Design a protein around this ligand. Structure first.
Ligand code: 82H
Lengths: 248, 19
């Protein structure tokens, strides 16, 4: 009264519509271009959400730019994983109410590769039966899970914020169960999924950056994603990325 | 027109925008 997890619940971005036209047969171009446009709108919701996260607007504006530019795909993939889990038991990729990627759509050329990585996040969320509260704390933690090699400007403050959300996730795990050995075992399992997201997003961005730089594919990108991708392409090499892991 | 400091970044514009 008020908990940080109830604040996260209030600020959780709404499920947006794709604006997909289903009165014309499917094609990979139409689906990927639509998911790109929808993706730019999801990035906007994520920035608006980050601004309401207690502690974030205390970081310097360059750190705020930095974390969103590094974490945007982690948020989208994780929230897609959550929706696909609750709505289909991780069988369908529930991008938008008007655009579900079912078995048929996955078989479309170029589709399956990016899809399997998304279905892995949802498979894991399903297999661990992640609760709403654990999901909200995990998602905040994914915004604070990658920083530059040399660090952020508000480093001590960033460390305070991340610790706050590591403790919120702890409380959501305790509330869900209440057994001390099973508590840390569940913390281990949830935190393992957070760690494994680094590789999921590394594969998502490697295909995403290939599609963005591909002159032949002609797949469109929204202006918001076009600018983040322009920055993050040189950030992968030389590697100015420090993964903040819970295990290793 | 007068000199301005309009922000070119869409991300930075979203981060500065109220409220
Ligand atoms: C940029 C990528 N483009 C490429 O990879 C490419 C193909 F162009 F190269 C694009 O990524 C995504 C990834 C998730 C996406 C979207 C659009 N909606 N959702 C989504 C759904 C549910 C919740 C949230 C979410 O963010 N929710 C809240 C808001 C803020 O926080 C919480 C976001 C686009 C992509 C394009 C086509 C794909 C694809 C991936 O994977 C499957 C095969 O087709």
């Amino acid at each position: 009264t008020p908990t940080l997890v109830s604040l996260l619940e209030v600020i959780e971005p709404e499920v947006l519509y794709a604006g997909y036209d289903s009165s014309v047969p499917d094609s990979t171009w139409r689906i990927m271009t639509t998911l790109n446009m929808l993706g730019g709108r999801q990035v906007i919701a994520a920035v608006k959400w980050a601004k309401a996260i207690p502690g974030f607007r205390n970081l310097h504006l360059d750190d705020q730019m930095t974390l969103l530019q590094y974490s945007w795909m982690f948020l989208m993939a994780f929230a897609l994983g959550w929706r696909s889990y609750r709505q289909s038991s991780a069988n369908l990729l529930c991008f938008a109410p008007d655009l579900i990627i079912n078995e048929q759509r996955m078989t479309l050329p170029c589709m399956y590769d990016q899809c399997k990585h998304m279905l892995y996040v949802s498979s894991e969320l399903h297999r661990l039966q992640v609760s709403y509260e654990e999901y909200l704390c995990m998602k905040t933690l994914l915004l604070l899970s990658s920083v530059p090699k040399d660090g952020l400007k508000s480093q001590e403050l960033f460390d305070e914020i991340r610790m706050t959300y590591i403790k919120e996730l702890g409380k959501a795990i305790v509330k869900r169960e209440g057994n001390s050995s099973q508590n840390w075992q569940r913390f281990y399992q949830l935190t393992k999924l957070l760690d494994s997201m680094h590789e999921v997003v590394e594969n998502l961005l490697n295909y995403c950056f290939q599609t963005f730089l591909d002159k032949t594919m002609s797949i469109e990108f929204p202006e918001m994603l076009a600018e983040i991708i322009t920055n993050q392409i040189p950030k992968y090499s030389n590697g100015n990325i420090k993964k903040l892991l819970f295990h290793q | 027109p007068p000199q301005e400091a309009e922000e070119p970044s869409l991300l930075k514009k979203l981060l500065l925008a109220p409220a």
